[PDB]
């Protein structure tokens, strides 16, 4: 699943602070996100990051 991405910000360099699922530790993390050039683990919360791949 999308889980299994690592931090990836994009092109753009917007200060949209977002979670990913740090897959590299095991946690759900925040990481700066850039509307232009995002991927799938990009969440706006804990909560989704979480959700999504981890209840």
Not at 11 to 16: E, M, S, T, V, W
Not at 34 to 42: A, E, P, R, S, T
Request: glycine share 14%; charged share 20%; proline share 5%.
């Amino acid at each position: 699943s999308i889980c299994s991405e690592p931090k990836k910000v994009g092109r753009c360099k917007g200060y949209f602070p977002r979670f990913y699922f740090d897959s590299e530790t095991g946690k759900c993390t925040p990481f700066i996100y850039g509307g232009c050039g995002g991927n799938g683990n990009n969440f706006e919360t804990l909560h989704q990051c979480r959700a999504i791949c981890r209840a």
